[PDB]
Design a binder for this molecule. Structure first.
Ligand SMILES: CC(=O)N[C@@H]1[C@@H](O)[C@H](O[C@@H]2O[C@H](CO)[C@@H](O)[C@H](O)[C@H]2NC(C)=O)[C@@H](CO)O[C@H]1O
Length: 858
């Protein structure tokens, strides 16, 4: 009843990691069905400061990205609902939560939990009648309230983990090659780095303002430029420094004769931008804006530059489905993109856990798919996921919101690429279309009910998705209703784009992870168990759609060869729908198109793939095959440009970490996307080990670069911003500019981490030192002004010769120290180091002085 829920709500949870490598320490993880026989032991403690809780009519719901495999307190049991939602229940042996005591529940989970961010907030209790209530101490974004600190070697994945734990003292060493450059060395430095620049000794004076000739630009675009000058403190007034613009396509030849190319001349009396096109003028204007200092000085170097993008596709991907991100945050993101010349916004509008775009005629997609709540019937909501509580959590962009975002992007020279992920990652859509089916079926409108249905009612396939959903995550590719649904959604989104004035140029099909994970390599069958694998019953495990009658008749009429070719076949069918709507380019995650013969199998004349295989695992060689089959390769490797991954190896950092353990501003910058094998000399793998890389195949080159923000643990907009910035500035650099240390691809060259020395790592180093300095001394102050809650790096620090020595990953940022427990903070001066004794803490501070990094002890 309610009373029981009220009592349970007052239980205080504490989560403590016991062992991240339980399989190495006597637990038989294989017998528990753990992938690759890997499991961890965690302790859940529930403390009661009230009277005894003796009822048994309750369920406690919690979220985890890890499956619970064993419960070591026999008074309780844990069962999976779907996705990340689990239930804790009392067994027949439960004898109550005693008054004033703690109950301990040790559990065994699959894999490892290396970051405290792995533990999700907002556990909740239910009981019969009653309205669900959260366990109040867990209703927070601060994990310190319920998750204990990691100690010792608990951050290690295996006993052989070679990653380096980052503390102030080891971080001091990783930053020791950095130094603060004098302001003179940063004069005339545009970033992204221009293709060619000659900096002269005179400076132009922008203090009385600039007089802009934006006649070449459509109004909305000219207004973006004018607002940005004003933001950075240069008033716009007619008597100011003249900046002239013109478009002249004929002055550009060969490979500089591309959209976004420009010639820039900054003089003492005036400036002139000549673009190949409007993007080119807009971009030459953003290059002047990049020189404006963060010191109030109003001076910029005179210079002559000529520039053009190395790639036509320079993208940022955003997931709004896992956790919604508001219109205001999307706009801020687009502002910053435009400032650093990023031009493609890949918008992931749907997935299992949410559907975020209003579709005229299919209201259930947003009414149901657009919100999560504790509704076991899933008629009004999708089940709760990702630690957002049991009550309604959600949002979506209305048709007008969406049109607004597209217009906003268009002014900023950014192309909006909508992604509606299929045929896996489609639970919001499938469940919403089921609620639609039920509603219409009840009114006796059976043809209407079935019109956009995404389920074959005969399908009993037993399949587990990557995120542990079942067959409801997989839209059925063989149904005529599924094609109707696809056609209708493409149609409606295409109309919004037409109204916004930016007609869709690329449809993103999705296509990722359309498989059953129980049939993967790390699991083994109960009957002939291979050692070191998760022992499960694999004889009742099906490939997706295996038991669909409709898919079976499709296979027998000869339309497709096997169940395995379904995803690729569906990609080919959707390309025909995309083409029919006037769209001549489709893009997909490469694994959904793997069984297609080549780009020729598609109806669009262009087919792009987001290439998301990790490099250290073979990506440096398998990427070639896509480019050579006609696909435009959009480099999206998780080991370098997944922005949902942690900035550093520290258990208190935010992020997922399946593809690598960290990717900081420096690592992202060091990525060489057009000569994949070379990264073997400049990076380490997910366990910190050196790797080797070689390809013997032809490499025509990549078409683009994209950095991804997946949103599982990015629950708020500030969290999203913490993960994207400032490392997306490194992405902008590398997607625009090819550095001298980025060598040409050579078939047969084998790069061996720690052994070969092909790459000019001293040039790489010098390039990074300058770039890190531009961020710390100029650009971060601009992000402050754009309202972006970027991550402030924690300082490196050591105590030497009686004084505190501190450093930082982005030289120029302020550093503070405290010698009294973090009560009083003082500013660090490198040229008058402070004498120190006992405990010191350090923290960094934003340029505007309002935000601080986390504080750490030396
Ligand atoms: C708990 C965990 O780490 N799971 C991993 C999945 O998240 C991951 O899926 C892919 O990665 C993204 C997160 O970085 C997902 O949001 C996304 O849906 C998915 N697909 C794409 C194209 O990235 C997979 C990758 O094999 O591994 C898991 O272990």
């Amino acid at each position: 009843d309610q009373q029981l829920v009220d009592q349970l709500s007052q239980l205080k949870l504490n989560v403590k990691m016991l062992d991240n490598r339980a399989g190495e320490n006597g637990v038989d993880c294989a017998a528990l069905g753990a992938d690759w026989a890997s499991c961890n032991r965690v302790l859940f403690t529930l403390s009661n400061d009230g009277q005894a809780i003796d009822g048994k009519d309750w369920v406690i719901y919690f979220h985890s990205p890890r499956q619970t495999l064993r419960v070591d307190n026999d008074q309780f049991k844990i069962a999976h609902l779907t996705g990340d939602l689990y239930k804790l229940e009392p067994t027949a042996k439960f004898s109550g939560f005693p008054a004033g005591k703690a109950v301990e529940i040790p559990v065994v989970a699959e894999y490892w939990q290396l970051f405290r961010n792995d533990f999700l907030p907002r556990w909740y209790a239910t009981s019969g009648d009653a309205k669900p209530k959260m366990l109040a101490n867990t209703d927070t974004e601060n994990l310190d309230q319920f998750v204990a600190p990691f100690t010792g070697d608990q951050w290690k994945r295996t006993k052989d983990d070679k990653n380096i734990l980052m503390t102030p003292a080891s971080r001091f060493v990783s930053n020791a090659d950095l130094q603060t450059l004098p302001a003179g060395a940063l004069r005339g430095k545009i970033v992204p780095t221009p293709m060619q620049v000659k900096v002269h000794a005179q400076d132009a004076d922008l203090r009385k303002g600039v007089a802009l000739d934006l006649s070449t630009l459509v109004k909305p675009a000219a207004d973006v430029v004018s607002q940005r000058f004003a933001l950075l403190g240069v008033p716009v007034q007619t008597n100011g420094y003249p900046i002239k613009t013109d478009i002249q396509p004929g002055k550009f030849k060969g490979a500089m004769a591309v959209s976004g190319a420009y010639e820039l001349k900054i003089g003492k009396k005036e400036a002139q931008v000549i673009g190949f096109d409007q993007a080119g003028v807009f971009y030459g204007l953003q290059s002047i804006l990049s020189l404006v200092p963060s010191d109030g000085s109003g001076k910029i170097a005179t210079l002559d530059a000529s520039d053009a993008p190395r790639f036509p596709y320079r993208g940022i991907f955003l997931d709004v489905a896992r956790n919604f991100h508001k219109k205001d945050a999307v706009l801020r993101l687009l502002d910053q993109m435009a400032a650093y010349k990023l031009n493609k916004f890949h918008f992931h509008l749907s997935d299992d856990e949410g559907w975020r775009i209003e579709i005229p005629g299919l209201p259930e997609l947003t009414e149901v798919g657009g919100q999560r709540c504790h509704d076991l019937s899933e008629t009004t909501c999708l089940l709760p996921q990702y630690g957002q509580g049991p009550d309604v959590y959600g949002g979506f962009f209305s048709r007008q919101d969406y049109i607004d975002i597209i217009k906003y992007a268009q002014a900023r020279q950014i192309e909006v690429i909508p992604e509606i992920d299929m045929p896996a990652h489609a639970r919001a859509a499938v469940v919403s279309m089921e609620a639609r089916y039920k509603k219409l079926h009840a009114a006796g409108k059976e043809q209407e009910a079935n019109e956009f249905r995404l389920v074959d009612p005969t399908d009993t396939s037993n399949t587990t998705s990557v995120q542990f959903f079942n067959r409801q995550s997989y839209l059925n590719p063989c149904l005529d209703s599924s094609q109707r649904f696809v056609d209708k959604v493409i149609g409606e989104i295409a109309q919004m784009h037409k109204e916004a004035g930016q007609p869709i140029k690329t449809w993103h099909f999705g296509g990722d992870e359309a498989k059953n994970i129980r049939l993967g390599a790390g699991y083994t069958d109960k009957a002939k168990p291979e050692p070191g694998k998760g022992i499960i019953d694999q004889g009742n495990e099906d490939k997706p759609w295996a038991k669909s009658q409709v898919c079976q008749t499709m296979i027998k009429e000869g339309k497709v060869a096997d169940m395995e070719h379904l995803p690729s076949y569906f990609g080919q069918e959707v390309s025909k729908l995309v083409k029919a709507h006037g769209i001549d380019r489709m893009q997909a995650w490469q694994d959904g198109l793997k069984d297609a013969e080549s780009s020729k199998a598609f109806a669009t004349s262009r087919v792009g793939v987001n290439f998301w295989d990790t490099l250290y695992w073979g990506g440096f060689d398998s990427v070639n095959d896509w480019a050579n089959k006609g696909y435009e390769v959009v480099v999206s490797n998780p080991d370098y440009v997944y922005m949902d991954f942690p900035y550093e190896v520290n258990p208190d950092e935010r992020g997922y970490y399946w593809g690598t353990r960290f990717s900081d501003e420096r690592k992202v910058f060091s990525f060489a996307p057009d000569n994949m094998p070379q990264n073997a000399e400049t990076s380490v793998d997910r366990d910190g080990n050196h790797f080797n890389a070689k390809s013997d195949k032809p490499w025509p080159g990549a078409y683009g670069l994209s950095a991804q923000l997946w949103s599982e643990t990015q629950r708020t907009d500030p969290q999203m911003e913490y993960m994207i910035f400032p490392r997306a500035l490194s992405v902008a650099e590398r997607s625009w500019h090819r550095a001298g240390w980025e060598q040409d691809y050579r078939a047969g060259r084998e790069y061996k981490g720690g052994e070969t020395h092909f790459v000019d790592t001293q040039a790489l180093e010098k390039d990074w030192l300058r770039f890190a300095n531009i961020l710390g001394q100029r650009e971060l102050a601009k992000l402050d002004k754009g309202g972006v809650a970027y991550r402030l790096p924690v300082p490196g620090a050591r105590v030497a010769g009686g004084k505190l020595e501190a450093n930082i990953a982005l030289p120029g940022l302020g550093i503070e120290y405290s010698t009294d427990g973090g009560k009083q903070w003082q500013r660090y001066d490198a040229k008058a180091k402070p004498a120190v004794s006992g405990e010191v803490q350090v923290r960094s501070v934003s340029p505007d002085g309002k935000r601080y990094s986390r504080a750490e002890k030396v």
